[PDB]
């Protein structure tokens, strides 16, 4: 409770395993990355699917 | 960031020396003085 500003959805969740917030949920799903390589992806491009 | 050969992991938490990606930075300590590689 903070005055009677709403701090939901604008904090972290530890409801989601990463702490983004469901503002910033949507703020990561509306930019579509390029899946780069931050991830190890030589395993997936050997697997070939 | 890939596969790291040499030093170790340990988990310990100090202040980012020498880093080495995604969160994980390398030093020089004690903890037999040689290399490690912590988060
Ligand atoms: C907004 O924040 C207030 C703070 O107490 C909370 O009571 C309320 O349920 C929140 N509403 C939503 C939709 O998260």
Redo the contacts with the bound molecule.
């Keep these: 409770?903070?005055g009677?500003?709403?701090?939901?959805?604008i904090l972290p969740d530890p409801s989601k395993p990463s702490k983004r917030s469901f503002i910033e949920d949507l703020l990561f799903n509306k930019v579509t990355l390029a899946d780069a390589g931050f991830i190890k992806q030589y395993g997936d491009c050997l697997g070939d699917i | 960031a890939g596969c790291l050969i040499g030093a170790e992991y340990v988990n310990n938490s100090y202040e980012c020396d020498i880093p080495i990606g995604a969160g994980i930075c390398a030093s020089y300590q004690t903890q037999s003085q040689s290399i490690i590689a912590y988060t």
């Design positions: 409770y903070f009677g500003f709403n701090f939901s959805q």
